[PDB]
């Protein structure tokens, strides 16, 4: 009985039902991760996401060493590699954490067919989400809830959540891992260079990957529970929830019991419920990330403007607040939710009137904490393309951050070319007189671009555009 556990999400040894069940009754246990380096550059996956993943894999491998096992990293496509491994290792069991996202579901269905057609038993267990999303969808009558309010109703009628024991020496028991001395050069965790990324200009990651870092942060986050809010927090947990280094169910229980000790609203579960809601909404919708052909998405005639899109993506808008946020995102992989509101409003309903699909693709590349379902759901939501509950405040790309940080310390940290400007002009340097730009050694339009748009005029038009869209929807 040779059992293999396939890692994709759920990159942890705690609360891993699929791994626990696969281990039980197995003589052999082997943990695999599959990636192809040749397609790493063309997959819209940025270097920070790759680095966080590789660090997750190093931590899994290290933690597996403590249990006397090892992680197997295989280069290739899962449809091509799994037949060879079934025969090479005489696989009897294959286990995966369930993936609700449509393209992952189709991929897993193909792998399940090949495993079964080869006489391999397929173990699937839910642990990336709090609930069985198909059970939520059934309780809603076969269609996913279209509103956060309806979703909360169904969750409130759900039975209280049960977690799962951590994989230990006592859990593994008499289960072995076949290991060779050539293992590291054959199945070792890849470097970024192997994936084709230049690392010479890199600095240490602000968000270190892995289950160890996630559980260390969780204890400090529970202990603890402006301009400094914008900076990454050493107790932030959102990337670890996305990659599965931290179980959302464990996080839920720890939050509940700390709250019980401190004092049971959904104020503290709000982020997890939004996460759960977008997974539920996307799971049966293969065009969830599209406007055309997406049955839940308002059809809005967005501008097609690649040059403006590229200015926003590359932090070259000429609005330092917007550019500092997009620069933090590209450099670190995480920005504050209020900063996401700011740059996403600017791109779509606010200033540039560019499709939410284009912002989603940029965020997909650079953002560490948003799966496909959450990214698409969040972009449709903020652009009033789906899940509509109200019109939104139009954020000011100059004033909003100025009230956040009057001195512009956030601007100065991520846009060093502007550090010479005084606070009076740091958020609108195109208003600085010529002599002031010279002193700051930053000529607007040479060292830093001019503003790409007039916010007052653009936002005024776009606020009205959105109203007309929704007046049409009332008539239909
Ligand atoms: C703009 O692109 C993005 C903005 C946010 C995300 N994102 N990432 C995670 C989560 C979310 N989304 C949210 O929480 C909400 C949201 C939406 C839009 C904005 Cl602007 C801000 C918040 C959904 C409705 C209210 C809260 C929750 S999570 O753990 O599941 C990690 C992704 C892409």
Swiss-Prot record:
Binding site residues for FAD: 238, 271, 337, 369-371
Motif window: LIR 9: 377-382
Regulation: KL001 (N-[3-(9H-carbazol-9-yl)-2-hydroxypropyl]-N-(2-furanylmethyl)-methanesulfonamide) binds to CRY1 and stabilizes it by inhibiting FBXL3- and ubiquitin-dependent degradation of CRY1 resulting in lengthening of the circadian periods. KL001-mediated CRY1 stabilization can inhibit glucagon-induced gluconeogenesis in primary hepatocytes.
Photolyase/cryptochrome alpha/beta domain span: 1-130
Cofactor(s) demanded: FAD; (6R)-5,10-methylene-5,6,7,8-tetrahydrofolate
Record motif LIR 7, residues: 317-321
Post-translational modification: Phosphorylation on Ser-233 by MAPK is important for the inhibition of CLOCK-BMAL1-mediated transcriptional activity. Phosphorylation by CSNK1E requires interaction with PER1 or PER2.
Annotated consequence of substituting residue 387 to A: Decreases affinity for FBXL3. Slightly increases affinity for PER2
Motif LIR 5: positions: 257-262
Outcome reported for the amino acid change (mutating residue 259 to A): Reduced interaction with MAP1LC3B and significant decrease in its autophagy-mediated degradation
Induction (record text): Oscillates diurnally, rhythmic expression in the early night is critical for clock function (at protein level). In SCN, exhibits circadian rhythm expression with highest levels during the light phase at CT10. No detectable expression after 8 hours in the dark. Circadian oscillations also observed in liver, skeletal muscle and cerebellum, but not in testis.
Key words of the record: Biological rhythms, Chromophore, Cytoplasm, FAD, Flavoprotein, Isopeptide bond, Nucleotide-binding, Nucleus, Phosphoprotein, Photoreceptor protein, Receptor, Repressor, Sensory transduction, Transcription, Transcription regulation, Ubl conjugation
An MF annotation (GO) of this entry: phosphatase binding
Per UniProt, location of the Glycyl lysine isopeptide (Lys-Gly) (interchain with G-Cter in ubiquitin) cross-link in this chain: 9, 105, 157, 311, 467
Motif LIR 11 mapped to chain: 412-417
UniProt motif LIR 2: location: 80-85
Subunit field text: Component of the circadian core oscillator, which includes the CRY proteins, CLOCK or NPAS2, BMAL1 or BMAL2, CSNK1D and/or CSNK1E, TIMELESS, and the PER proteins. Interacts directly with TIMELESS. Interacts directly with PER1 and PER2; interaction with PER2 inhibits its ubiquitination and vice versa. Interacts with PER3. Interacts with FBXL21. Interacts with FBXL3. Interacts with PPP5C (via TPR repeats). Interacts with CLOCK-BMAL1 independently of PER2 and DNA. Interacts with HDAC1, HDAC2 and SIN3B.
Entry comment, domain topic: The LIR motifs (LC3-interacting region) 3 and 5 are required for its interaction with MAP1LC3B and for its autophagy-mediated degradation.
Homology family: Belongs to the DNA photolyase class-1 family.
Record-given protein name: Cryptochrome-1
Organism: Mus musculus
Lineage: Eukaryota, Metazoa, Chordata, Craniata, Vertebrata
């Amino acid at each position: 009985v040779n059992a293999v556990h396939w890692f994709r999400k759920g990159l942890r040894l705690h609360d891993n039902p699929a791994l626990k069940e696969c281990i039980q009754g197995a003589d052999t246990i082997r943990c695999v991760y599959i990636l192809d380096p040749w397609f790493a550059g063309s997959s819209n996956v940025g270097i920070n996401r790759w680095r966080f993943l590789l660090q997750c894999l190093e931590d899994l491998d290290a933690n597996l060493r403590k249990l006397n096992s090892r992680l197997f990293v295989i280069r290739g496509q899962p449809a091509d590699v799994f037949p060879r491994l079934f025969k090479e290792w005489n696989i009897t069991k294959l286990s995966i954490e369930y993936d609700s996202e449509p393209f992952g579901k189709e991929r897993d269905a193909a792998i399940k067919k090949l495993a079964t057609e080869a006489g391999v038993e397929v173990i699937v267990r839910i642990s990336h989400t709090l609930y069985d999303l198909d059970k939520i969808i059934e309780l809603n009558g076969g269609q996913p809830p279209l509103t956060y309010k309806r979703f909360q109703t169904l969750v409130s009628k759900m039975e209280p959540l049960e977690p799962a024991d951590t994989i230990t020496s006592d859990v593994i028991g008499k289960c072995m891992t076949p290991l060779s001395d050539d293992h590291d050069e054959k199945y070792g965790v890849p470097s970024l260079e192997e994936l084709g990324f230049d690392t010479d200009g890199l600095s240490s990651a602000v968000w270190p990957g892995g289950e160890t870092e996630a559980l260390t942060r969780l204890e400090r986050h529970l202990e603890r529970k402006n301009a400094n809010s914008l900076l990454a927090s050493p107790t932030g947990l959102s990337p670890y929830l996305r990659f599965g280094c931290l179980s959302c169910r464990l996080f839920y229980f720890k939050l509940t019991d700390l709250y019980k000790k401190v004092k049971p609203p959904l104020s503290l579960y709000g982020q997890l419920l939004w996460r759960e809601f977008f997974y539920t909404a996307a799971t049966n919708n293969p065009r969830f990330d599209k406007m055309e052909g997406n049955p839940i998405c308002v059809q809005i005639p967005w501008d097609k403007n690649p040059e403006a899109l590229a200015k926003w993506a590359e932090g070259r808008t000429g609005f330092p607040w917007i550019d500092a946020i997009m620069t933090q995102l590209r450099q670190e992989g995480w920005i504050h939710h209020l900063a996401r509101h700011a740059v996403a409003c600017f791109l779509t309903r606010g200033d540039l009137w560019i499709s939410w699909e284009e912002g989603m693709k940029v965020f997909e590349e650079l953002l560490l904490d948003a799966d496909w379902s959450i990214n698409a759901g969040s972009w449709m939501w903020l652009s009033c393309s789906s899940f509509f509950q109200q019109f939104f405040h139009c954020y000011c790309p100059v004033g909003f951050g100025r009230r956040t940080d009057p001195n512009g310390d956030y601007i100065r940290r991520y846009l060093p070319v502007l550090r010479g400007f005084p606070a009076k002009y740091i958020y609108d340097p195109w208003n600085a007189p010529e002599g002031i730009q010279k002193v700051a050694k930053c000529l607007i339009g040479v060292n830093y671009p001019k503003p790409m748009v007039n916010h007052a005029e653009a936002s005024r038009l776009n606020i009205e555009r959105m109203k007309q869209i929704y007046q049409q929807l009332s008539r239909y």
